[PDB]
Symmetry: C3
Subunit: 314 residues, 3 copies
């Protein structure tokens, strides 16, 4: 596939610092090269230069609203640019708050997009329902059209325009959802597969249902927002808010291998990789390595193998 | 749900000491509080004061028959009391021999009860078939009506009255069964899902079948006897007789989440947690933490989330 | 079952030394005894004395062709001998290149054999498609009749005669396949279940399909070539070429428990156990222990339990 890489070293969506190093470590793991090593046409748009906003006091409980809203605004423009270039945007990021800009920018060029959100969390708290005030746990609330009237005017998000309906998104991996978030899930009728459903159906049926649900009516561009804490912390420990009982490495690759095969992936986010939270240098590489494997699968790397259009035996 | 907590610091059902500390560590992990943190009405009946029986020589091969039979006799009375109070009995115990008193006491108030036994073992050896002489591996034999004639009069169990039929129990997680125990399984036609069946069907079908098998004919109270060594030792290492290839954390929560949803749980045992067998302080917390998570799920904690009967967006 | 044990301390099929110690460590783990401990008739044919071939320069890129071809030639004769004795051959080996002799010798006595290859790799590279030159990654190419014309005359393999068709083999566990190997898979129409398929279908359906595919038409002897790197390295780390995202311990036992139940197993290989590659003494025992468990299951050891044809309650 044709890829448009976007580095988003941002962390203000949550407390822990180290997430802005995600692009750095992921690139240094040889992600660009390894992608090119496949049948991929890769163009790096570099790391977005997120200007420092020293003056950014809390909006009620919401922390760093201006810094977050600005970073997402910038990322949205860069993402829309890449799509206009006919490339799949690959956002190497910091915290998941960036999803607001990523999905917004993508929807400008492809308003008919469907979203698959792999995460241990729903990140659908509103500025009013959140108890942490961390914006990486509210991105989805800003994008949903149905919640357009329940979201206050938070400094930094004047540019935001809800671009998706509760029916154009599917969650996979949920295992830590706030009461307010669960209320929204049930109220808006959002389709989700928490770890309970994965256990019940198996990752195979979960993906069949997911794609069927999003592509049943008609084929449409797919945006995959992958939070690394969606996978079990035995695989991606270096992350801000880990939760045990997560998706396995295998299930992670299965999800992505399936998305790739649809031939409809046009947007991807690899989020929450925080190198500073690895208790050992090995937990860091284990997290980065896993994050790269997930990425490579999104672009064709298959476990059963891959081969060029030629006669290898001749 | 309405809960009746019963502490059973007993260990004489097996060799290793540390199991009598199960109640202590589980309560200190904040189990009562966390249960109350949910929509639970909790009443603690304290830790049963199991008097010391200095004179208790072996009955043939069976060890500490009087101490075990007495502890179970006491627990049975305390359990029957809690049920008469309209509460779900939660037995925080030491070794699994206590299951004899727990299930006996429960059946006095609800003779139509069905049992789900999550364990790496069948614990169905008779005083005559056992090779270890440890009573935590014989509880089921004392409760089965069909085996009423194959169980000798063991000092301390004169009060025992077989209260369940081979058809009112389902095993889940089996992976270490003695030849004599397997003979009983096949002879009495007991329904079981060893790790082989879990692998073949998936934990989802296993629970569908289990509940269908026990609640198909009619709805009836459910007694869940959960031995922590039923889960893989990578999750609950601090336990007396661990066996690799066990149920996963996820499968563990799935089982319990499903039991809860039946709305028929009225008896629960969380057994074999031995803090003294953790090779590290972390193996201890990992075991206790997992044991608490299992418990919380039995009373409503859902991975997809929970919310109060109110409008969170207002 | 009646077993014929064959030790094959060979390593020249790949770079790392320690694999020739496989027989040693496996026997010292009490494999013979434990097999006898079951309803097994065991006869040890000892460890094959593989003479040293000092003069063995590479054939193009292929390393140690004479040493490998000779060891396999010897093993083939020893294996054919054991089958003529009406025993199931159990090859405790070094590297997987020995599969060439094992399967060849087995097919001489049972030309209608079907093969199940559990491995992270397809080991189907030809001397011409291989990029490593390591023969433990080419065994299958030497045995397939369809590739008879694409295999050059490599010093040491004049005795070889392709003995199986692409349709008499099923792969399980694939997750690291070379482009040339994948081309062969798709071209010859070989049946396989990579980790992608295991994830999609579940190990239960995978085995149903495997056996159905190999025994559907008619019942025929089964040859199981089990490479320990087929299982996840968290279970068998002491091995030459480990790959993450492998089969679980449970899935490993499930596969073998199912093979056993067919009552058609007549050939078995337990390969790639390299004690020298364990980073700790525990990784070594974990690998050997797992390798023994796999073996025991092939000969009857069931997780649900086993019992003699007698009345245990009497
Ligand atoms: N994305 C996370 N980690 N969410 C946690 C919690 N639901 C919040 O909004 O802070
Ligand atoms: N419950 C256990 N660990 N049972 C082991 C063995 N079946 C016994 O009776 O001692
Ligand atoms: N069997 C292994 N490890 N194969 C690796 C690779 N396909 C080769 O031929 O060297
Ligand atoms: Co998350
Ligand atoms: Co997230
Ligand atoms: Co047990
Ligand atoms: Co038990
Ligand atoms: Co291999
Ligand atoms: Co191999």
């Amino acid at each position: 596939r044709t890829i448009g890489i976007i580095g988003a070293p941002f962390s203000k969506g949550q407390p822990r610092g180290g997430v802005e190093e995600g692009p750095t470590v992921l690139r240094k793991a040889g992600l660009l090269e390894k992608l090119k090593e496949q049948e991929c046409d890769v163009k790096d748009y570099g790391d977005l230069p997120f200007a420092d906003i020293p003056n950014d006091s809390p909006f009620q409980i919401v922390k760093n609203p201006r810094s977050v809203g600005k970073a997402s605004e910038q990322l949205a423009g860069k993402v829309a640019e890449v799509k206009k270039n006919g490339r799949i945007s690959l956002v190497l990021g910091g915290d998941h708050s960036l999803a607001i800009g990523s999905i917004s920018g993508h929807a400008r060029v492809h308003p008919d997009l469907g979203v698959i959100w792999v995460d241990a969390h729903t990140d659908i708290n509103t500025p009013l329902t959140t108890t942490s005030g961390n914006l990486h746990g509210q991105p989805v609330s800003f994008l949903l059209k149905e919640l357009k009237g329940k979201i206050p005017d938070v400094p930094g998000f004047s540019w935001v325009t809800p671009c998706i309906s509760a029916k154009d998104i599917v969650y996979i991996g949920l295992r830590d959802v706030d009461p307010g978030e669960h209320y929204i899930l049930k109220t808006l009728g959002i389709k989700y597969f928490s770890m309970t459903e994965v256990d019940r159906l198996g990752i195979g049926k979960v993906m069949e249902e997911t794609l069927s649900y999003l592509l049943g009516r008609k084929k449409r561009p797919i945006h995959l927002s992958f939070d690394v804490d969606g996978l079990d912390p035995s695989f991606t420990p270096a992350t801000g808010t880990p939760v045990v009982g997560g998706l396995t490495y295998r299930e992670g690759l299965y999800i992505t291998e399936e998305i790739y095969k649809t031939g409809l992936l046009s947007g991807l986010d690899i989020m929450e990789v925080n190198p500073s939270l690895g208790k050992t240098p090995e937990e860091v590489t284990r997290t980065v390595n896993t994050a790269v494997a997930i990425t490579l699968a999104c672009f064709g790397l298959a476990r059963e193998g891959n081969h060029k259009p030629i006669d290898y035996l001749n």
